[PDB]
Subunit: 511 residues, 3 copies
């Protein structure tokens, strides 16, 4: 029952095989892209899990014979464009595995696996709303190039990975040599045209295989029950509760507010909690679109209050503390004799007022560390005029916003503190989004609740001259070109404000 479908992808062949391998998986496909081979599978639990949480996991692993954080980064990469495309309220366990059986570094295993994963879900009976595809873009002598080779990347000014579906982009994640907003936005959409071909090719396959999807019947809310709950919510001043300034106190009051409504009033309880969460969600979203005020009283373009300090640790080579609202990071730098530069990120439970077991670095901590390292490596001096190794470790002492971005600001402080002759300071911020069908509002410097109840989390970092790194994921089907362009601009402003503050603290590398 083996079926082979073939095409071209940036000057080398792309083959997708199904029906032969891993047939107990809900769906499974083998991807040959040049000399790169990847087996991708998608499996779902039999019945759906309880509670309001969608367990979705993506793994990636490169076999020893195919030729250690990269695998974790890659798996996080593939999760991003796939996660938002499941019917709302679908809470089956879904696990997606990718095994790189053969790896030609000129033919991206990361991108092969991403398409592999899309295909495996698309042939499966799992109700995924793709296909999706992803692509790598470089930028050499003013020309964009798809899936550049190892040697072209040595020379590109951009290392971008874009992904999305038929009608829109889903995810971007990038590192760059300080390139303009418009250079980036063009790269994005050059990338998306190829994405569109790739999706096209996957749909023909789906049209040929004609898989039978499982039927997800989403329940329709009881108009009347909503109405009752929506009254007990209005009487107890939900609006004013939401507008509590302090993070922990806001969450405490909301919990309590819900904690009371539910006691009115088991399967009926599950509903009331769910109705409550949407009513909270709506209130927050309404306040922003209609009254232009966020739940800590800010306006869509205002950044949180900023504080910073340098040299706070006696014996360390460099040290920086950066505080933006209820998010705070301490970054520490060590120099060494003579991989050459790295940045780690640690997120303790106390940072969010929580108790729990202490572990080895998790997936998220590994992500943010590398994001930080990516944003910064472009401004680190040449080994030729500064022969030392540089390690930076960032500790998140408090968190409500973007620890990862705060750590980039922290680390820039530490680098200057330490007297590292860097190209230019770097700062970063995270952008948010509320869409109403009438229109959208872009939010600057978002807090946790805005990520959680918003539509995107779009992190941009770079210098005054331009962008050094991006990482973006979303919780709606797609982002239009004008929303991306606007976000980049408003993030350019945001970062500029932040570098301005940072230079009050230290205005150049120590001597």
């Amino acid at each position: 029952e083996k079926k082979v479908f073939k095409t071209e992808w940036a000057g080398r062949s792309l083959t997708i095989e199904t029906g032969q391998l891993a047939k107990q998986a809900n769906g499974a496909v083998l991807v040959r892209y040049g000399d790169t081979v990847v087996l991708s599978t998608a499996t779902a639990s039999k019945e759906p899990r309880d509670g309001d949480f969608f367990p979705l996991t993506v793994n990636y692993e490169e076999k020893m014979y195919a030729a250690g954080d990269d695998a974790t980064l890659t798996a996080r990469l593939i999760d991003r464009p796939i996660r938002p495309l499941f019917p709302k309220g679908y809470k089956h366990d879904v696990q997606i595995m990718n095994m790189v059986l053969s790896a030609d570094p000129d033919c991206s295993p990361q991108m092969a696996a991403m398409i592999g994963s899309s295909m495996a879900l698309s042939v499966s009976d799992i109700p995924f709303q793709g296909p999706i595809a992803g692509v790598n873009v470089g930028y050499i002598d003013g020309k964009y190039i798809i899936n550049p080779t190892v040697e072209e990347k040595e020379v590109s000014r951009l290392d971008l990975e874009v992904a999305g579906h038929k009608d829109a982009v889903n995810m971007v994640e990038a590192g760059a040599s300080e390139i303009t907003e418009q250079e980036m936005l063009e790269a994005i959409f050059f990338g998306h045209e190829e994405i569109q071909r790739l999706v096209d090719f996957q749909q023909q396959i789906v049209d040929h295989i004609q898989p039978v999807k499982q039927e997800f019947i989403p329940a329709e809310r009881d108009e009347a029950l909503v109405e009752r709950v929506k009254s007990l919510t209005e009487e107890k001043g939900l609006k004013e509760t939401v507008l509590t300034f302090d993070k922990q106190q806001r969450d405490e009051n909301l919990d309590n507010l819900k904690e009371e409504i539910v006691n009115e009033f088991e399967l009926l309880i599950k509903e009331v909690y769910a109705i409550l969460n949407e009513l909270v969600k709506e209130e927050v979203r309404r306040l922003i679109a209609d009254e232009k005020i966020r739940p800590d009283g800010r306006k869509p373009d205002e950044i949180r209050p900023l504080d910073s300090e340098v040299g706070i640790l006696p014996r360390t080579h460099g040290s920086g503390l950066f505080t933006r609202g209820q998010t705070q990071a301490l970054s520490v730098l060590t120099l060494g004799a003579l991989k050459r530069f790295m940045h780690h990120y640690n997120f303790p439970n106390f940072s969010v007022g929580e108790t729990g077991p202490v572990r080895a670095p998790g997936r998220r901590e590994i992500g943010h560390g590398a994001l930080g390292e990516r944003a910064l490596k472009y401004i680190i001096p040449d080994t030729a005029d500064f022969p030392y190794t540089i390690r930076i470790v960032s500790e998140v002492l408090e968190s409500n916003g973007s620890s990862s971005q705060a750590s980039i600001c922290g680390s820039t402080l530490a680098l200057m503190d330490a007297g590292v002759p860097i190209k230019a300071p770097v700062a970063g911020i995270a952008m948010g989004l509320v869409t109403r069908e009438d229109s959208y509002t872009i939010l600057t410097d978002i807090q946790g609740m805005e990520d959680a109840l918003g539509d995107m989390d779009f992190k941009v970092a770079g210098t005054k001259e331009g962008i050094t790194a991006i990482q973006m994921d979303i919780k709606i089907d797609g982002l239009t070109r004008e929303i991306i362009e606007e976000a980049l601009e408003q993030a350019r402003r945001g970062r500029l404000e932040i570098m301005n503050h940072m230079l009050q603290t230290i205005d150049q590398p120590r001597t």
Copy 2:
């Protein structure tokens, strides 16, 4: 209250001490065999665990100081095998058995000392174990069998066998061999068992002296009438035809559903109905085989599942083989290197059985099957003298219903030929099964998961056309007679020969 009991075991002393050490354990014994010393203990939970599953664990560990300076996992699995089937049916207490090698003379097998240690500890305990059991190592030099050969005799034996069992029968065999005949193996087995019988004899005297007081296991007796009701609702809903569903996942789905309905008729009463259902399923399968001579995928006791294979499916790897037998499938990949010298690993992902779950480090089972594979193969691997390269093979189980471990041996033989390794001879393997009715027994060839689970044994044999290179067998009944054993070996010789025949269509000699 120290008591010392003494005897001879293959030309060296064997002493068993109890009453002094580890007296809070339900039972505990110290074993001195030559200069080897092992402390063995057996402990049971106070009350029995819930559900229909017998938690039994065996550990083995060799201290750092034991020599005056994966094997432990293999050894612990070895000791579990003959011990597990000998507990009263329905006994579901946690039982844990620990073995500590305090001193280790490699000429006096710590593995065997521990195995007898473990039997003794349970036998003196109040845990209702139905032994004793004992185990022995057999070599084969210039046509003579030898018990517990020394290191230097093993350098020269044609057989490395570990046999075990009780008073009246053999329980377990596990072996590696230089391509020896079926009768040469069966004799070794029963030479081994005569010594086993002495060892059991010696343990029984001890038990007769210590006179331990066992805990009283009252097995419930089934309600004749309730069985009858359930057995009708099962007959009306076509259990027989349900069982005969061809597709593995679909068979399990329908059976679950069938049970899923009967139970809803209809809490402590539910536990019973589920248990009654499982036995009725068990009986139907067993009946179909003994009486109608058809297995639940419609095969007959001697037919092997449909076979497919391929070589060279991975571009850049030195050797590559894909082997498919029914709904079980394995991909084996080979890497060559400069210059421990040969190894084989085995990986079993969850998707192989259509499951979701967390990915882990190699488990116990995966370590077992890997080594079983490596054992079956090492005998046919060339001398380092005429082929100076290291050889690693990794086998991935992409689907599973039968014997992954045997499929991986077939896969690896393909990969070795693919890679151009001048091997002695191809090797294949299979797993044999067994249904006993009191009237008579049927031996099953190439069993599927359900046949292992509801059958009486799982008897894996692998080797060349000239003879056997490896065995591993465990059982779920009290013992295996000599005629069954012999018949199984013969029918497994046929089975393997069929498989090598197919394999040679794919590749008929080393590339």
Copy 3:
């Protein structure tokens, strides 16, 4: 809202900052002590956990850039902090300490200990401190606080004392065979500084004026207690307690409770709790009033002893030591040429239990190092005995003090092996029952006496003097007389034990 409070601590500055860092923690403080910096935090779960168990965790970690020990340090800090929470308070509390900068002359361990006290004291968590801790050395007859690295090279004592305003809470020490009075003085020299440190923390609390959360302890239903206390008297609780065999005692007690409860859900939780206190009381009463412990011993009698040497053929040295239902086997390996270490392993079968086997836990790492500390002082100079020495101790049974049994075991193994050691070493664990009328000190305690008693005070050393201590308590504090009496009675105890040990082997093999 940054606030900085400053003082002197043994000739160097001590600064405590709050209000700036880690403000989502219930409380948090930064400690600068010389060039050492430590951030300490204290966080509590929102609501209290179910069941009768207080989850309290302390972590400690020294960053890579700051320049088993971390586990030892974290266990150190837990000890004086644990007993000072209101009885029945069962919130998760976690306490973290991060050494951001570490000057080994200014103890990060002590900075963190005060850090942890401060973080709780500024928090809304109802901790009953402050507490503080201090290091004492002993050079040419003079005690010194927080000696530097180079002074420790030359001290005869490495002591860490801690406690609160009115009493000492915890001691843990290693020593070059020093007398009981020499130790007890060091302890109380240490406590005067502790008192300054607590004083300084109290002013801070008086300045910050934190608002504590209100812990309302329920009051027992006099009448329900009375009913339960009758069903307990009728079924012979007293006689049940006096069962000799450990497992059998626990089995009967479980069963006894198992019956009373069935009389008789939220009401059940109460009956179980009432039962546990009635058991607790019976045991305590028997000791104070009848002077008999629940295995029939008297407050000063040690359990029956047995020992053996050379039980393993091929190992360089081997010792088996049994004291009551606690038993340890210690094994020694010699090597070419960190130089001495002792490990401790505690399998589940040792207590008749089943469970998963793991990497060495926290407790096992503690006891191993306690053992190693007690012994290193008597191990020969590398000059006249050029070999590495590893000893591993296995606890085959346990009811008492495995850690002390392992020290006895290891001394046996060292002699067995022919190691020319300074002198044998033995150890024991002391216990305590306080009634408001008076107290009884218990020698060589069993598990139940630790669990239902007021302290667990382990002392080990030679005939000439003490080599190691480790003590924690379950009451607010220990007076000086109790701590002096315990040391003396532990000196006697150990002497008995060395006496027995020398019957087995009276000098290093030759």
